[PDB]
Amino acid sequence: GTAGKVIKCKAAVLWEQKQPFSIEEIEVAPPKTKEVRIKILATGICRTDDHVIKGTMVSKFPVIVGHEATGIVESIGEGVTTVKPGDKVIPLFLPQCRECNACRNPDGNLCIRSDITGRGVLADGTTRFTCKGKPVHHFMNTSTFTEYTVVDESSVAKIDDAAPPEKVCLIGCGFSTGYGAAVKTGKVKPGSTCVVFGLGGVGLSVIMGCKSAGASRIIGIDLNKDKFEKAMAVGATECISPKDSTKPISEVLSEMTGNNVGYTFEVIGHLETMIDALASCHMNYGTSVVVGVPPSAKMLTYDPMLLFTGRTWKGCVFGGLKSRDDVPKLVTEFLAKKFDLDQLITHVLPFKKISEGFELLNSGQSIRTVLTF
Amino acid sequence: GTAGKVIKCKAAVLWEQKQPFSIEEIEVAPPKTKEVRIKILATGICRTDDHVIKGTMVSKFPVIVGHEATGIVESIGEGVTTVKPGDKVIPLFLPQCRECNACRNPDGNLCIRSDITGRGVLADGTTRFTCKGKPVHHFMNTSTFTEYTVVDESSVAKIDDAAPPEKVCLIGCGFSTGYGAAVKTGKVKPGSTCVVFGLGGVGLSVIMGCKSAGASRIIGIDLNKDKFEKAMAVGATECISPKDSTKPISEVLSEMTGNNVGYTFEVIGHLETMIDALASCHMNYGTSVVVGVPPSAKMLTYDPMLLFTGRTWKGCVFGGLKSRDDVPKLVTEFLAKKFDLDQLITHVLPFKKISEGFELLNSGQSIRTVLTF
Ligand SMILES: NC(=O)c1ccc[n+]([C@@H]2O[C@H](COP(=O)([O-])OP(=O)(O)OC[C@H]3O[C@@H](n4cnc5c(N)ncnc54)[C@H](O)[C@@H]3O)[C@@H](O)[C@H]2O)c1
Ligand SMILES: NC(=O)c1ccc[n+]([C@@H]2O[C@H](COP(=O)([O-])OP(=O)(O)OC[C@H]3O[C@@H](n4cnc5c(N)ncnc54)[C@H](O)[C@@H]3O)[C@@H](O)[C@H]2O)c1
Ligand SMILES: [Zn+2]
Ligand SMILES: [Zn+2]
Ligand SMILES: [Zn+2]
Ligand SMILES: [Zn+2]
Ligand SMILES: [Zn+2]
Ligand SMILES: [Zn+2]
Ligand SMILES: [Zn+2]
Ligand SMILES: [Zn+2]
């Protein structure tokens, strides 16, 4: 078997920033203590991965990004008790050590293992993939744009065998974040009026969340009018584009709802919309959840009076879900015909066609692209 | 009687900003439809009143400030049905029409009638005071540094007759704000560790709030060490001064609590301290309530990652209390010996000694000074 020896395989390595991917043969060192080596079956293309290339999100290069996926367990390391080889799992970019401060805190989730610093290694303070002698860095405790990867046990959730790898892979980042941001983070209330800024893969996920919450009205806001039709299929009661009017978006939504915007979700990644998403929620009882990651090295400049009058402004990391616990239950839900992930997946391509997936994304012609292996 | 005629009396008029008060003979007009003319018995000095004179709070001039008070109803206009002359009432700077959007929403309170914009006038766009021919503007739908004042029915809470005026007047701003800030707005959890930025009159009220919540550890932060003693009496577990160490406060409180600071309240009004208060709470599950009023026309500049990690940031007005409903309830709790409001009252001076009251505060030698008539 391979269990115990260096594996050689294909990987969409990224040598520099703003540089294109190049599929290359790498050396997946076998798992160490409490580590697991996974064989990736399917991996989706999320906006975060695209951020790395553009420079909007820093990382150590060379890197093997990707984090939204699902695979089978090839071999487990020393001590691995939660999963055995053959098990269907989903790597988790947000760990759940079950011992750290937040992991202990019922209203927390950002484990101490989490890598939002751009460390590019595992707990061991080291890398598993090699290439041309050169070591290559991990991405957010995961790295799924590769045939095989190694993740700490703290980053592995075991899901149902019946789960179709192409659909459930969305649950590793896109759907769990969006859905949770509405249901968990913002705790949308039945009857409220939600408005989503960004009709992307994660945005539509929130729309679904609001739909499960019972939101009476859901307004989809997006620059690309071609997204509306799908947003509405998912649950949007109406959508609009910021350019439809010359008067501020906050005044638009204000007059549209009758100054009743109860919730607002920023799922884009721009400072400006982080502010008009805030402003667009009711000055007193409106909540504005920031789901999109702000551009690296940028500082937001705002009017405190927006917050002072009573606004609740909260951040969101993986829908505030506790990965090792929620990922499993969420997958069961999908199988329970609760929701339809099919409506988010617009393109399924083979890994070799990874550049087509990305471009289709930047072209605004694909919600979620699934790269199957 | 007076009921129906213009009253003449003394009031602490402020002709210009940066200018000293000036006790003068004013003419308080009789109340119009659904308005109430009240005779002020006691009025405390809030830091907000001081903001007006310093310019950090925009208001039209001339203006009769003051809003933390209690008095008795002298005459009621037509339609007034909630109160009758003789009644002991508390003027409300934050109205409660019971019909606007915020009023009808359970988790809101900033009623549409509020004057957070500096209008300086009653619902009918007019002012009741006059002085040397010249019109004098109200302050926050109240204006209490006068022997008499006129307010709209939506800004009048009918209290318990037995309530002592120079004590329950704190429930009109100071105590209601601070207490509600921790109990209602921030909903402090039993066992939590809270930190208070500012040990003034409102700050101390927050400590009493957290203490009521069951906060296992409360840390008071103030740069004026002489207030600590009072804080500790109020409920503080320990106090610190930002100057006591060179290592930024956020790192200090973290080392102090083992990165378990769950709640933070900014009760001072400085942009820099608002930042320090955000950073000071747990990056994933920490809440940071802003109670201080941010300086006029100034923007806040911070790092969005602080919020993105999961922190809750919320503003606070009147401790999130629904005025006409909560103020009465609060007073009774007071008479029921629930809280010791006397621990906040450091001075009681006659109205004409107002300037000393303000000096007392600016010299950091008084928590809450009550100016009695
Ligand atoms: N915090 C998290 O857990 C988390 C999870 C997933 C994704 N993200 C972040 O979410 C954001 C987007 O992710 P996605 O995967 O859903 O991407 P996506 O590309 O599919 O969607 C981007 C959406 O934003 C719209 N948009 C961009 N600029 C706009 C503007 N100026 N005004 C209005 N609309 C505009 C696009 O048209 C599209 O509708 C990024 O910040 C990504 O890093 C965060
Ligand atoms: N939002 C509201 O509903 C509401 C209600 C009442 C009062 N307020 C605001 O309350 C805020 C606090 O004022 P207050 O009424 O309690 O009176 P205050 O002036 O006495 O409180 C200031 C307190 O904070 C301390 N302080 C001042 N600058 C500081 C700094 N740089 N670093 C650390 N500590 C500092 C002072 O020593 C004092 O203890 C004011 O800004 C006032 O506008 C707001
Ligand atoms: Zn992602
Ligand atoms: Zn953890
Ligand atoms: Zn954009
Ligand atoms: Zn006040
Ligand atoms: Zn005027
Ligand atoms: Zn109202
Ligand atoms: Zn100060
Ligand atoms: Zn006492």
mmCIF file of C-alpha atoms in Angstrom, chain B residues 92-328:
data_model
loop_
_atom_site.group_PDB
_atom_site.id
_atom_site.type_symbol
_atom_site.label_atom_id
_atom_site.label_comp_id
_atom_site.label_asym_id
_atom_site.label_seq_id
_atom_site.Cartn_x
_atom_site.Cartn_y
_atom_site.Cartn_z
ATOM 1 C CA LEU B 92 -37.311 61.700 29.051
ATOM 2 C CA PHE B 93 -34.564 62.735 26.585
ATOM 3 C CA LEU B 94 -35.333 59.527 24.723
ATOM 4 C CA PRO B 95 -39.089 59.534 23.872
ATOM 5 C CA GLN B 96 -41.445 56.588 23.465
ATOM 6 C CA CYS B 97 -44.325 57.445 21.123
ATOM 7 C CA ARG B 98 -45.302 53.743 21.215
ATOM 8 C CA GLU B 99 -46.083 53.916 17.491
ATOM 9 C CA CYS B 100 -42.855 54.273 15.544
ATOM 10 C CA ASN B 101 -40.882 51.377 14.092
ATOM 11 C CA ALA B 102 -38.258 51.267 16.861
ATOM 12 C CA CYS B 103 -40.909 51.617 19.536
ATOM 13 C CA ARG B 104 -42.908 48.689 18.215
ATOM 14 C CA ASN B 105 -39.829 46.516 17.852
ATOM 15 C CA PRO B 106 -39.085 44.606 21.105
ATOM 16 C CA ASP B 107 -35.334 45.032 20.831
ATOM 17 C CA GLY B 108 -35.334 48.716 19.966
ATOM 18 C CA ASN B 109 -35.891 51.955 21.852
ATOM 19 C CA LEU B 110 -34.559 54.964 19.951
ATOM 20 C CA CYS B 111 -37.969 56.428 19.169
ATOM 21 C CA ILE B 112 -38.421 58.555 16.030
ATOM 22 C CA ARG B 113 -39.097 61.601 18.205
ATOM 23 C CA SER B 114 -35.646 61.611 19.790
ATOM 24 C CA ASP B 115 -33.462 64.652 19.188
ATOM 25 C CA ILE B 116 -30.011 63.137 18.633
ATOM 26 C CA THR B 117 -29.566 65.553 15.695
ATOM 27 C CA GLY B 118 -29.532 68.703 17.822
ATOM 28 C CA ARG B 119 -32.854 70.074 16.622
ATOM 29 C CA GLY B 120 -33.392 71.910 19.907
ATOM 30 C CA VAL B 121 -37.165 72.120 19.506
ATOM 31 C CA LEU B 122 -40.417 70.304 20.421
ATOM 32 C CA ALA B 123 -42.457 68.112 18.031
ATOM 33 C CA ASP B 124 -44.215 71.179 16.663
ATOM 34 C CA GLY B 125 -40.887 72.644 15.565
ATOM 35 C CA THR B 126 -40.968 75.393 18.159
ATOM 36 C CA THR B 127 -39.277 76.329 21.422
ATOM 37 C CA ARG B 128 -41.024 77.127 24.717
ATOM 38 C CA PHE B 129 -38.336 79.249 26.398
ATOM 39 C CA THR B 130 -37.706 82.938 25.786
ATOM 40 C CA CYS B 131 -35.076 85.283 27.243
ATOM 41 C CA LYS B 132 -34.693 89.018 26.622
ATOM 42 C CA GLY B 133 -36.999 88.663 23.620
ATOM 43 C CA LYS B 134 -34.716 86.019 22.111
ATOM 44 C CA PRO B 135 -35.861 82.395 21.611
ATOM 45 C CA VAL B 136 -34.083 79.716 23.634
ATOM 46 C CA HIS B 137 -33.712 76.139 22.439
ATOM 47 C CA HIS B 138 -34.302 72.929 24.317
ATOM 48 C CA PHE B 139 -31.820 70.155 24.670
ATOM 49 C CA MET B 140 -32.563 66.512 24.004
ATOM 50 C CA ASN B 141 -36.345 66.853 24.228
ATOM 51 C CA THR B 142 -35.956 67.901 27.881
ATOM 52 C CA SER B 143 -33.905 70.886 29.171
ATOM 53 C CA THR B 144 -33.816 70.693 32.952
ATOM 54 C CA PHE B 145 -31.377 73.331 34.207
ATOM 55 C CA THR B 146 -34.442 75.543 34.650
ATOM 56 C CA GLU B 147 -37.048 75.931 37.374
ATOM 57 C CA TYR B 148 -39.654 74.927 34.799
ATOM 58 C CA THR B 149 -39.594 73.190 31.404
ATOM 59 C CA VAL B 150 -42.063 71.945 28.820
ATOM 60 C CA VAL B 151 -41.847 68.538 27.190
ATOM 61 C CA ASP B 152 -43.968 66.347 24.919
ATOM 62 C CA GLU B 153 -46.154 63.673 26.549
ATOM 63 C CA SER B 154 -44.015 61.012 24.866
ATOM 64 C CA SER B 155 -41.115 62.271 26.980
ATOM 65 C CA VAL B 156 -42.804 62.020 30.363
ATOM 66 C CA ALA B 157 -42.594 59.029 32.663
ATOM 67 C CA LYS B 158 -44.937 59.096 35.689
ATOM 68 C CA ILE B 159 -42.994 57.827 38.732
ATOM 69 C CA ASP B 160 -43.804 56.707 42.284
ATOM 70 C CA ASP B 161 -44.615 59.653 44.571
ATOM 71 C CA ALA B 162 -42.457 58.385 47.438
ATOM 72 C CA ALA B 163 -39.358 58.500 45.211
ATOM 73 C CA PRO B 164 -36.801 61.007 46.511
ATOM 74 C CA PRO B 165 -36.045 63.676 43.830
ATOM 75 C CA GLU B 166 -32.335 64.207 44.512
ATOM 76 C CA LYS B 167 -31.749 60.491 44.166
ATOM 77 C CA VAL B 168 -34.077 58.997 41.548
ATOM 78 C CA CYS B 169 -33.119 61.765 39.097
ATOM 79 C CA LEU B 170 -30.080 59.603 38.227
ATOM 80 C CA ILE B 171 -32.555 57.177 36.657
ATOM 81 C CA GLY B 172 -33.214 59.769 33.938
ATOM 82 C CA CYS B 173 -29.811 59.235 32.325
ATOM 83 C CA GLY B 174 -26.705 58.188 34.260
ATOM 84 C CA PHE B 175 -27.897 55.036 36.043
ATOM 85 C CA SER B 176 -30.444 53.935 33.430
ATOM 86 C CA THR B 177 -27.760 54.115 30.743
ATOM 87 C CA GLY B 178 -24.999 52.316 32.628
ATOM 88 C CA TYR B 179 -27.274 49.695 34.195
ATOM 89 C CA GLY B 180 -29.163 48.923 31.004
ATOM 90 C CA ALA B 181 -25.879 48.893 29.099
ATOM 91 C CA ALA B 182 -24.766 45.745 30.938
ATOM 92 C CA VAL B 183 -28.133 44.132 31.750
ATOM 93 C CA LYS B 184 -30.098 44.838 28.547
ATOM 94 C CA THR B 185 -27.842 45.996 25.715
ATOM 95 C CA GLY B 186 -24.859 43.747 26.450
ATOM 96 C CA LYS B 187 -26.832 41.127 28.392
ATOM 97 C CA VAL B 188 -23.842 40.255 30.621
ATOM 98 C CA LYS B 189 -23.705 36.518 31.352
ATOM 99 C CA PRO B 190 -23.405 34.983 34.812
ATOM 100 C CA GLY B 191 -19.766 34.130 35.392
ATOM 101 C CA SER B 192 -18.356 36.510 32.801
ATOM 102 C CA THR B 193 -15.386 38.856 33.123
ATOM 103 C CA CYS B 194 -16.238 42.441 32.173
ATOM 104 C CA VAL B 195 -14.066 45.544 31.886
ATOM 105 C CA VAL B 196 -15.245 49.142 32.271
ATOM 106 C CA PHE B 197 -13.465 51.991 30.445
ATOM 107 C CA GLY B 198 -14.366 55.068 32.496
ATOM 108 C CA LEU B 199 -15.272 55.194 36.178
ATOM 109 C CA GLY B 200 -17.568 58.205 36.085
ATOM 110 C CA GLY B 201 -21.230 58.297 36.941
ATOM 111 C CA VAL B 202 -22.340 56.134 34.047
ATOM 112 C CA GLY B 203 -19.320 53.846 34.348
ATOM 113 C CA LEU B 204 -20.088 53.042 37.981
ATOM 114 C CA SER B 205 -23.724 52.341 36.976
ATOM 115 C CA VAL B 206 -22.366 49.752 34.470
ATOM 116 C CA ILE B 207 -20.407 48.017 37.272
ATOM 117 C CA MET B 208 -23.614 47.856 39.303
ATOM 118 C CA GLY B 209 -25.239 46.351 36.190
ATOM 119 C CA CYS B 210 -22.592 43.688 35.595
ATOM 120 C CA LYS B 211 -22.652 42.911 39.321
ATOM 121 C CA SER B 212 -26.401 42.432 39.051
ATOM 122 C CA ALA B 213 -25.745 40.140 36.043
ATOM 123 C CA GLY B 214 -23.470 37.887 38.045
ATOM 124 C CA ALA B 215 -20.214 38.858 36.356
ATOM 125 C CA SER B 216 -17.629 36.893 38.332
ATOM 126 C CA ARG B 217 -14.834 39.394 37.663
ATOM 127 C CA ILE B 218 -15.213 43.127 36.888
ATOM 128 C CA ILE B 219 -12.190 45.321 36.127
ATOM 129 C CA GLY B 220 -12.547 49.094 36.247
ATOM 130 C CA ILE B 221 -10.188 51.095 34.042
ATOM 131 C CA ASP B 222 -9.712 54.822 34.573
ATOM 132 C CA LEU B 223 -6.699 57.116 34.487
ATOM 133 C CA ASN B 224 -7.884 59.018 37.574
ATOM 134 C CA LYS B 225 -6.877 56.639 40.369
ATOM 135 C CA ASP B 226 -8.980 58.428 42.990
ATOM 136 C CA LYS B 227 -12.212 56.962 41.539
ATOM 137 C CA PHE B 228 -11.092 53.319 42.064
ATOM 138 C CA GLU B 229 -12.084 53.383 45.764
ATOM 139 C CA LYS B 230 -15.673 54.209 44.762
ATOM 140 C CA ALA B 231 -15.596 51.627 41.969
ATOM 141 C CA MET B 232 -14.600 48.911 44.402
ATOM 142 C CA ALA B 233 -17.448 49.956 46.730
ATOM 143 C CA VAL B 234 -19.839 49.735 43.794
ATOM 144 C CA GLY B 235 -18.795 46.231 42.713
ATOM 145 C CA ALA B 236 -15.399 46.315 40.970
ATOM 146 C CA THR B 237 -13.149 43.291 41.489
ATOM 147 C CA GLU B 238 -10.020 45.309 40.725
ATOM 148 C CA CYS B 239 -9.121 48.498 38.887
ATOM 149 C CA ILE B 240 -6.286 49.582 36.629
ATOM 150 C CA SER B 241 -5.042 52.761 34.977
ATOM 151 C CA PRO B 242 -3.906 52.814 31.336
ATOM 152 C CA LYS B 243 -0.709 54.517 32.501
ATOM 153 C CA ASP B 244 0.302 51.835 35.016
ATOM 154 C CA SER B 245 2.169 49.947 32.260
ATOM 155 C CA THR B 246 3.841 50.638 28.921
ATOM 156 C CA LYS B 247 2.464 47.503 27.281
ATOM 157 C CA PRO B 248 -0.851 48.442 25.549
ATOM 158 C CA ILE B 249 -3.978 47.908 27.613
ATOM 159 C CA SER B 250 -5.430 45.155 25.363
ATOM 160 C CA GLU B 251 -2.424 42.928 26.072
ATOM 161 C CA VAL B 252 -2.616 43.816 29.739
ATOM 162 C CA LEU B 253 -6.236 42.771 30.283
ATOM 163 C CA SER B 254 -5.551 39.600 28.268
ATOM 164 C CA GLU B 255 -2.643 38.644 30.527
ATOM 165 C CA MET B 256 -4.823 39.636 33.444
ATOM 166 C CA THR B 257 -7.752 37.405 32.475
ATOM 167 C CA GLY B 258 -6.058 34.710 30.412
ATOM 168 C CA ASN B 259 -7.696 35.925 27.229
ATOM 169 C CA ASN B 260 -11.182 35.461 28.689
ATOM 170 C CA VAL B 261 -12.391 39.048 28.732
ATOM 171 C CA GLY B 262 -15.925 38.417 27.514
ATOM 172 C CA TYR B 263 -17.382 41.942 27.727
ATOM 173 C CA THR B 264 -16.090 45.481 27.329
ATOM 174 C CA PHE B 265 -17.859 48.828 27.801
ATOM 175 C CA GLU B 266 -16.524 52.159 26.668
ATOM 176 C CA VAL B 267 -18.010 54.747 29.009
ATOM 177 C CA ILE B 268 -15.793 57.776 28.285
ATOM 178 C CA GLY B 269 -16.358 59.083 24.743
ATOM 179 C CA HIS B 270 -12.876 59.004 23.161
ATOM 180 C CA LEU B 271 -12.303 57.483 19.713
ATOM 181 C CA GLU B 272 -9.014 55.969 20.859
ATOM 182 C CA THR B 273 -10.638 54.349 23.900
ATOM 183 C CA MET B 274 -13.397 52.893 21.719
ATOM 184 C CA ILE B 275 -10.686 51.086 19.754
ATOM 185 C CA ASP B 276 -8.964 50.040 22.969
ATOM 186 C CA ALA B 277 -12.317 48.719 24.214
ATOM 187 C CA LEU B 278 -12.928 46.669 21.038
ATOM 188 C CA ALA B 279 -9.454 45.189 21.042
ATOM 189 C CA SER B 280 -9.797 44.570 24.762
ATOM 190 C CA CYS B 281 -12.557 41.960 24.442
ATOM 191 C CA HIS B 282 -12.093 38.386 23.240
ATOM 192 C CA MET B 283 -11.379 38.380 19.466
ATOM 193 C CA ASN B 284 -13.886 35.594 18.857
ATOM 194 C CA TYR B 285 -16.664 35.761 21.465
ATOM 195 C CA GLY B 286 -16.080 39.143 23.055
ATOM 196 C CA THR B 287 -18.686 41.921 22.944
ATOM 197 C CA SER B 288 -17.747 45.594 23.141
ATOM 198 C CA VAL B 289 -20.608 47.981 23.970
ATOM 199 C CA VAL B 290 -20.008 51.665 23.280
ATOM 200 C CA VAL B 291 -21.859 53.898 25.760
ATOM 201 C CA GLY B 292 -19.791 57.054 25.421
ATOM 202 C CA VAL B 293 -20.845 59.687 22.909
ATOM 203 C CA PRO B 294 -18.213 59.995 20.129
ATOM 204 C CA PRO B 295 -16.870 63.507 19.436
ATOM 205 C CA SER B 296 -18.677 65.587 16.828
ATOM 206 C CA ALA B 297 -17.667 65.236 13.182
ATOM 207 C CA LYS B 298 -14.892 62.720 13.729
ATOM 208 C CA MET B 299 -14.278 59.437 11.988
ATOM 209 C CA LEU B 300 -12.989 56.251 13.504
ATOM 210 C CA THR B 301 -10.101 54.354 11.913
ATOM 211 C CA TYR B 302 -9.613 50.692 12.827
ATOM 212 C CA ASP B 303 -8.468 47.315 11.498
ATOM 213 C CA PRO B 304 -11.495 45.320 10.220
ATOM 214 C CA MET B 305 -9.773 42.050 11.168
ATOM 215 C CA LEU B 306 -10.539 42.959 14.791
ATOM 216 C CA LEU B 307 -14.208 42.588 13.993
ATOM 217 C CA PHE B 308 -13.938 39.870 11.331
ATOM 218 C CA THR B 309 -12.590 37.345 13.875
ATOM 219 C CA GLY B 310 -16.010 37.257 15.524
ATOM 220 C CA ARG B 311 -16.245 40.225 17.880
ATOM 221 C CA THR B 312 -19.602 41.928 18.509
ATOM 222 C CA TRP B 313 -19.612 45.713 18.460
ATOM 223 C CA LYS B 314 -22.746 47.500 19.552
ATOM 224 C CA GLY B 315 -23.750 51.030 20.406
ATOM 225 C CA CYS B 316 -25.902 52.048 23.333
ATOM 226 C CA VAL B 317 -28.489 54.759 23.959
ATOM 227 C CA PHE B 318 -30.273 54.956 27.344
ATOM 228 C CA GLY B 319 -29.004 51.448 28.104
ATOM 229 C CA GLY B 320 -31.399 50.111 25.458
ATOM 230 C CA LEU B 321 -34.330 50.755 27.747
ATOM 231 C CA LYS B 322 -37.821 51.583 26.557
ATOM 232 C CA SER B 323 -38.245 54.938 28.339
ATOM 233 C CA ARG B 324 -41.884 55.318 29.339
ATOM 234 C CA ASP B 325 -41.900 51.673 30.467
ATOM 235 C CA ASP B 326 -38.520 50.946 32.044
ATOM 236 C CA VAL B 327 -37.924 54.195 33.954
ATOM 237 C CA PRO B 328 -40.979 53.614 36.192
#
